[PDB]
Each structure stands twice: as C-alpha cells, then as structure tokens.
Design a protein around this ligand. Sequence first.
Ligand SMILES: O=P(O)(O)OC[C@H]1O[C@H](OP(=O)(O)OP(=O)(O)O)[C@H](O)[C@@H]1O
Ligand SMILES: O=P(O)(O)OC[C@H]1O[C@H](OP(=O)(O)OP(=O)(O)O)[C@H](O)[C@@H]1O
Ligand SMILES: O=C(O)c1ccccc1Nc1ccccc1C(=O)O
Ligand SMILES: O=C(O)c1ccccc1Nc1ccccc1C(=O)O
Ligand SMILES: O=C(O)c1ccccc1Nc1ccccc1C(=O)O
Ligand SMILES: O=C(O)c1ccccc1Nc1ccccc1C(=O)O
Ligand SMILES: [Mg+2]
Ligand SMILES: [Mg+2]
Ligand SMILES: [Mg+2]
Lengths: 346, 343
Amino acid sequence: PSWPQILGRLTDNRDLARGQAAWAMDQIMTGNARPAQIAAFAVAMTMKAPTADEVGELAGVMLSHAHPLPADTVPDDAVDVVGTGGDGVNTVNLSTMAAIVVAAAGVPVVKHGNRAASSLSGGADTLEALGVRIDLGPDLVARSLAEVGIGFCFAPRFHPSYRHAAAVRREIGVPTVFNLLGPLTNPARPRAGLIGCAFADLAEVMAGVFAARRSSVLVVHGDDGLDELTTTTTSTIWRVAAGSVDKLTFDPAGFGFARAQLDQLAGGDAQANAAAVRAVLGGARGPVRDAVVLNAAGAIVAHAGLSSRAEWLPAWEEGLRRASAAIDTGAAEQLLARWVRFGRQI
Amino acid sequence: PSWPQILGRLTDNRDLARGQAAWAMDQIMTGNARPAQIAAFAVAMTMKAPTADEVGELAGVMLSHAHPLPADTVPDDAVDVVGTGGDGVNTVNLSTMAAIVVAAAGVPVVKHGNRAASLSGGADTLEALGVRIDLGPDLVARSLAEVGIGFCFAPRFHPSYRHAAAVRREIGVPTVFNLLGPLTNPARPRAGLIGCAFADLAEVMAGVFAARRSSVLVVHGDDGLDELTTTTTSTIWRVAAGSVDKLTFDPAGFGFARAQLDQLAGGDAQANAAAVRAVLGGARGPVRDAVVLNAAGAIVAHAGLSSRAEWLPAWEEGLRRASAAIDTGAAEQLLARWVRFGR
Ligand SMILES: O=P(O)(O)OC[C@H]1O[C@H](OP(=O)(O)OP(=O)(O)O)[C@H](O)[C@@H]1O
Ligand SMILES: O=P(O)(O)OC[C@H]1O[C@H](OP(=O)(O)OP(=O)(O)O)[C@H](O)[C@@H]1O
Ligand SMILES: O=C(O)c1ccccc1Nc1ccccc1C(=O)O
Ligand SMILES: O=C(O)c1ccccc1Nc1ccccc1C(=O)O
Ligand SMILES: O=C(O)c1ccccc1Nc1ccccc1C(=O)O
Ligand SMILES: O=C(O)c1ccccc1Nc1ccccc1C(=O)O
Ligand SMILES: [Mg+2]
Ligand SMILES: [Mg+2]
Ligand SMILES: [Mg+2]
C-alpha cells in the first residue's frame, strides 16, 4: 500500500483494489499526505471514473473519523437535505429552505452543510444571517433536533481532520470525486435524504454508495444543471430503496407546476438569501415557493421510502400536500423562530 | 487563461487550446503554481493523453527559462543521447556509454540529466567515473570544445523547474513531465538518439522533434527498453526534414546476436561505472553489442542532418565508426580526458 502504487493504478485507468481508496483517505486525514498527493489522487480517480466501492471507502474513512452524535439521539427516520453544490447557477438556498419545511411537517431533519464554495451564500451563511446557530457541537445538535425537530451539522466542525483535503479541493478549483463527499458524510448518519448532485456523470455512483449502506435516498440532478429538484424543466432522479437504484426522470408538470426560468430562483448575498427564506416561510407565492415545496416533498418521499410499503405517486402527492401545509399553517415559519430562540437560549 | 479553465478542459478529456499548456507551464516555472495545481495538471495531462503540440509548448517554456550555453558555443551538428527513463529495468547506463563512443568518433555530444530517482542514472554513473557533472554553462561549453563532450546538470540549467521537481518526487508516478527530459536539452542540439520507455508516447515525442526540424531517431525496443535493443526488434521514428517515419528495426540484419534482458543489469554507481570501463577496455559480449548499436544510431541521426543520407549505408558507417572508436581505445581515452578536464 503506497502513493506511487495507488496513483499508478489510477493513471493506468484501473479500478483500485479493495482497501486502497480507504488507505488513501486515511493518509489524507492523519496529515500524512502531501497536497500534491491529495490532488493527484482526486484528479486521477475522477478521470478513471470512480466506482461506488471506491467512493464508499472514502466516505467510510471520513465518517470513521467524524465527531459522532451521542448514542440514541438521532431518530431512525431522520433525513438530510443537502447537495454537492458547484452547479454554477447562483440560487437561493433551496435545500436549507426545504429542510426547514420538512422538519415542520414532522419529519426529523439533521442537515449537513457548509458555507458557500462557488456561490454568494451557502446554506450555513444563510442560516447564520437568519440567526440560527451554525456552530453547535454534537451534544447541542442532538438537543436542537430533540427540542426543535431540526439540527444543523456544520461540516467543518464535525470533520476537522478533512481540513487538508478541503483546502486542496479549493486549490484545484475543478470539480472532482471529492465534491461527492460532503453529502455522503453527514456525521449523524441519517438513513434518508434528498441529495443533490451537480455532476450528472457522478450521480449514479453517489446513489451506489447510498445503496450499499441501505439508505432511502433520492439523488437528484436538475436537467438544467441544478443540484436540486428544479422547476425550470425535468430532473433526473436516482431512486435508492432496498439496496438498489433505479433511474427516473421527474416532471413537475405532472403535479401542476408551471415552468420557471432559472433567473427566478437566483440568489444574492447572505442577507438577500435570508430575506428570501423569510418571504417563503411567510407565505409569498411564486417560483421560489414552488421550488421549496417540490424539494421538501422529495425529501418526504425519501423518508417514506424507509417503509417500503411506499408507492411513487401517492408518495409525491402526500409529500406536496404535507410540504404546502407546513408552510400554509405557519408551522414552518414558527419552526424557524423556535430554532433561532433555541440557539440564543444557549 | 486560468487553472479552473485548463484543468476542467483536461478532465473533460479535451486537448488544450493553443498556448494553454505554455501558460500552465510558465505558471509552474515562475513559482506561481500551488503544488496541488502542478500535480493536478501533471496527472490530468497524462490521463487525457498529451499531443505533440501540448508537449512542445511545455518543453518550449522550459527552454525559455533554461540557462543557455554561450552563443557560438554549440556546433550545428551536436547530438544528444538520452532516454525518458522510467524503465523499472535497472540496467547499465547504455546511453552514457553510447554517448562516450559517439563523441570519441568525432561527433560533438551535449548531454543532459539528473541523478536517478532510484539506482544509478546518467549523472550518478558519470560521477562514479570521476566526471564533474555539474559544471556551469561556460565550462560545459569549453568541455564540448576541448573534450568533444559535455554534460548539462538539470538542477544547474533548469533551476526554475524546482517546483515541478518537488511534485514529481511526491507523486512518484510517471506523468507527462517524464517526457520533457530529452526535449529540454539546454544546449538544444538538433540531432539525437532519443529513448522512450512508454510506447504510446514515443510518437508524440517524435512529433515535437519534427516541429523543431531535428534529425532524431526516437527509439522503442519492442521489449520495452528506452534504447535500441538487441533482445528483439525495435520501433524507430525517423525524424528529418520535419516529417516522421515509423519503421521497425532489426539488429540481426547487421549481424547482432540476440541477448537476454538480464545481461544488461547493474545498479550501483560503482557497478555501472566499472561496466563502463570494461566495455571501453574492449570487453566483448552483449553490453558492448548494445553500446555499439546505440552509438551507431546516434551517428545515423547525426548523418540525417544532411538530406542526401541513405538508411542502410548510414547504419553501416555508424557501426563501423562506433566499433572503431572503442577498438582503437579512442573511447577509453576520451573518458580519461573528460575526467581530467574537470580539474
Ligand atoms: O457554492 P456552491 O459549490 O455552488 O454550492 C452551494 C452550496 O451547496 C451546498 O448546498 P446545500 O444543499 O448544503 O444547501 P442549499 O441548497 O440550501 O444552499 C453548500 O451550501 C454549498 O455552499
Ligand atoms: O531513475 P531513472 O528515472 O530511471 O533515471 C535513469 C536515467 O534515465 C535518464 O538517463 P540517461 O538516458 O540520461 O542516461 P543513461 O540511459 O545512460 O542511464 C535520466 O537522466 C535518468 O536519470
Ligand atoms: O469542503 C469540503 O470538501 C468538505 C467535505 C466534507 C466534510 C468537510 C468539508 N470541509 C471542511 C472540513 C474541515 C475543515 C474545513 C472544511 C471546509 O469546507 O473548508
Ligand atoms: O552550481 C551552482 O552554483 C548553481 C547555480 C545556480 C543554480 C543551481 C546550481 N547548482 C545546484 C543547485 C541545486 C543542486 C545542485 C546543484 C549543483 O551544482 O550540483
Ligand atoms: O530537486 C531537483 O532534483 C531539481 C531538479 C530540477 C531542477 C531543480 C531542482 N531542484 C533545485 C535546484 C536548485 C535549487 C533548488 C532546488 C530545489 O529542490 O528546491
Ligand atoms: O526526467 C528525467 O529523468 C530526464 C530524462 C532525460 C533528460 C533529463 C531528465 N531530467 C530532467 C530534465 C529537465 C528538468 C529536470 C529533470 C529531472 O530529472 O529532474
Ligand atoms: Mg442544496
Ligand atoms: Mg443548490
Ligand atoms: Mg538512457
């Protein structure tokens, strides 16, 4: 096991032997990997085309070093709403808005997230501008989830030993297999999720990883390129249920949604994006609401897949009903208020 | 241009635009590229499959930054005798020996190299023989004149390559950078016998030499050697007049026995050095056979600097000249004279 061996195999376009991807990530996280080695490995794996085995190994190492939540503190049916980012469109924070709404429908949510990478305001930037605490440690994220119905795991706080890899990722400024790893390494390990993938060529592999750990996940790619379920056109969904993956194309027109234009979903700085969260939770009708409800419903469909009695059309119809109701009743707006108060009450 | 633009293009499996490889390499050469960006570019260029245009851009930037030899110092017909390396097959430095013979035959040789990554490369073997390997430009120029051979130490002549060099060692896998050695001789000889281990990159290297109108034999032993092999046939890319000919070459057409890959082995600086003195001392057998044939090849490349050069008669002249330079003790005496020069 060594860098020349592993890098040599990748550059010869061969899949890694079992344990090699794991060995490599473990080196990255114990500080025994040079930035050049980290970059070479990220790039070579990408051009070879990563397998689910390899990417699962990498995320496995990461999770094996992540700060876990206290035992018996994350409900068996908790869901995440998170994406790779890197979609190149400056959007409002559809995942963070959908998460709030999903929690308010009564589904426990433990969202993994981070500050912006290639946009003006990431999930964490926006939650912060709203007055939500993005700085909580495990014991306090667990309390948030118990008391409020939602917790936020700020990726850097829970994965401090990934710091070198995250730096190299940003130094290279080209998407690689490493861009998959955030959504795959929520430290609370929820079993369900709506998982956005910006990179169409990698979403299948991502779904393979969720499939191996028997998650109930919808891996989503907007056909306009969004790492979210889009309203401008169709979305490609890799539906992961009972250890397998099937590829579906989803059309919001089937559920009465008008086509939107990308520029209608455009976001701004943290303050702009925060005001957009408030306008949606306050009942403002239009494109942004439609996209939040659609994404919230996809998370709820994922949640329902944990039972496997679940049927695709009734699921979506229930998801939409529940998501819209959570906004309409004020539950979602009140949930955000209660989330803010919780963090201020220490 | 930018790194995100260049790296994204390479990972989507596309050839670079004109001048992007030059841009990237100039960033690397001016201390402006982070190690991660160097490594990213090196790997992605390698897995995309580099073109002759791209590799020419890279080599060009290196030569722009290289310490040159003084003007009117390098004869028009100087040759190089060199390989990419990366062979894995730890053999005696056939290049270094062939080069001494070529010089002793009266063809000016200006060579170029670093110490081995592994166990004794061009530079190492030469040091064990007593040659001063890291003379500066003026002294390499005087060596070339007075001795008929000189050696340009890569860290001495390409010292802005240090950032790329660090990354090559950390990565420890062959990349496109492994190709640049034969392509970045700071004395810029126009002729050469150029060994390439990688079979799929030999033709690219040849394309680069064709662009600069070099009279070069880029050689690949159908047995994986980065020199003309006696084990089997060889693939030669004959570069002259700016065009390439891929032909297949058999030494037995000139009367060479076959050999075993094992008979060429040797690792220690002192083991390769002793094997130099032995062949130059007239020891017959497979090592000399390989030295002579590679020396002849470099002589054939030299001859191709004249348009009216015929393949078979040129090779006959080359072998005869190479054999004679050893047999008369001319090669042995040049090496002793070389050793003595650096004093
Ligand atoms: O800056 P980018 O690389 O283009 O990615 C946008 C964001 O992707 C993640 O989104 P997440 O799904 O976690 O939250 P969101 O959709 O609510 O922003 C995280 O916020 C990234 O910063
Ligand atoms: O560890 P390696 O990468 O294999 O290095 C062996 C040498 O290959 C080249 O040698 P050159 O052709 O200049 O001389 P030689 O073939 O006689 O050894 C290059 O200068 C390397 O130092
Ligand atoms: O950014 C990522 O690729 C990432 C992916 C998964 C987990 C954490 C991640 N980021 C970090 C981790 C530790 C310190 C800083 C960061 C950072 O984002 O700057
Ligand atoms: O030799 C010089 O004075 C010199 C001048 C400028 C740049 C490099 C130089 N030499 C080296 C540098 C690094 C390692 C070995 C050497 C060497 O000469 O063996
Ligand atoms: O390290 C090498 O083998 C090397 C190879 C080619 C060019 C430069 C090189 N290194 C240097 C040369 C002069 C000064 C400093 C360095 C350095 O390593 O920082
Ligand atoms: O890649 C080779 O070993 C090589 C092969 C043939 C001639 C020279 C070579 N080396 C270099 C050339 C230019 C700059 C740095 C180097 C270096 O090795 O550090
Ligand atoms: Mg998102
Ligand atoms: Mg997004
Ligand atoms: Mg050689």
